[PDB]
From a paper:
To target disease-causing proteins that are inaccessible to small-molecule or antibody therapies, we are exploring the use of a nature-inspired drug modality that exploits the intrinsically favorable properties of synthetically constrained α-helical polypeptides (Helicons). Here, we report a rapid, high-throughput screening platform utilizing phage display that enables an unbiased mapping of the α-helical interactome of a given protein without any prior knowledge of its structure or known binding partners. Analysis of 14 high-resolution crystal structures of Helicon–protein complexes across six different protein domains reveals a range of binding modes, all of which are “side-on”, i.e., mediated exclusively by Helicon side-chains rather than involving main chain amide interactions. Biochemical and structural experiments demonstrate diverse functional impacts by the Helicons which bind these sites, including inhibition of protein–protein interactions, inhibition of enzymatic activity, induced conformational rearrangement, and induced dimerization.
We began with the E3 ubiquitin ligase RNF31, which is an integral component of the linear ubiquitin chain assembly complex. RNF31 is a 1,072-amino acid protein comprised of multiple folded and disordered regions. We screened two of the nonenzymatic folded domains, the PUB and UBA domains, each at multiple concentrations and in the presence or absence of a known binding partner. Binders to the RNF31 UBA domain, all of which compete with its partner Sharpin/SIPL1 in the phage screen, could also be grouped into at least two families. One of these families, comprised of Cluster C46 and C47, was characterized by a shared compact pharmacophore containing conserved leucine/phenylalanine, serine, valine, and tyrosine residues that was observed in two shifted registers. Biochemical characterization of members from C46 revealed that several Helicons bound with mid-nanomolar affinity. However, when we analyzed a cocrystal structure of one of these Helicons, FP06655, in complex with the RNF31 UBA domain, we observed an unexpectedly large conformational rearrangement when compared with the cocrystal structure of the RNF31 UBA domain in complex with its natural binding partner Sharpin/SIPL1. This rearrangement involves a significant rotation of the bundle of three N-terminal α-helices of the RNF31 UBA domain to form a groove in which the conserved leucine/phenylalanine and valine residues of FP06655 engage one wall of the groove, and the conserved serine and tyrosine residues engage the opposite wall, thereby stabilizing the RNF31 UBA domain in this induced fit. To confirm that this binding mode was not an artifact of crystallization, we showed that Sharpin UBL indeed competes with 5FAM-labeled FP06655 in solution. Together, these data illustrate the ability of Helicon binding to cause extreme induced fits, another feature of Helicon–protein recognition that we have now observed in several contexts.
Numbering used by the authors:
A (entry chain A): 487 to 626
B (entry chain C): 1 to 17
Write the structure that this text describes.
Amino acid sequence: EGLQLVSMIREGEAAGACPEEIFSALQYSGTEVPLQWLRSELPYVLEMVAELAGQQDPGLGAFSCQEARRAWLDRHGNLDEAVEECVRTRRRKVQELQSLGFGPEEGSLQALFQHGGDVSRALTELQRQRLEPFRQRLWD
Amino acid sequence: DPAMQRCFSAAVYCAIS
Ligand SMILES: *CC(=O)Nc1ccc(NC(=O)C*)cc1
Ligand SMILES: [N]
């Protein structure tokens, strides 16, 4: 097993080469790309999905790795479909929280990011952030 | 380059699966 490839690919990461460029060059060279490296670059793809979703709709806040992973898996790695589903899913949750008196101005966008897009965990965090201002104003 | 990102995403999913 010629493990020369992954060490050279790990050189490219050290020098700062783009994973897509490493992959595209290997495919143009007819070289078998090590599946272990592709699988290990999943976090890079999910960060790619998340920031593309942020570019697609500023004002929905930052997208979590958990939300990008669900969209990306559900769309079978189709990058454009994953970003669109990522955006549509988040907009639904921002509206769901909005319907409970928690809009973007109240910090719902940041609570959805901090909790991977779980509406239940975000609602509990937002309730706490309403309770602490009262605790410190009621005592002072 | 946008084609390269799309290829990478699809390739990484094939590898994962
Ligand atoms: C350009 C593009 O989409 N390429 C591409 C190459 C290979 C694969 N499949 C595997 O790596 C298994 C998908 C897409
Ligand atoms: N796979």
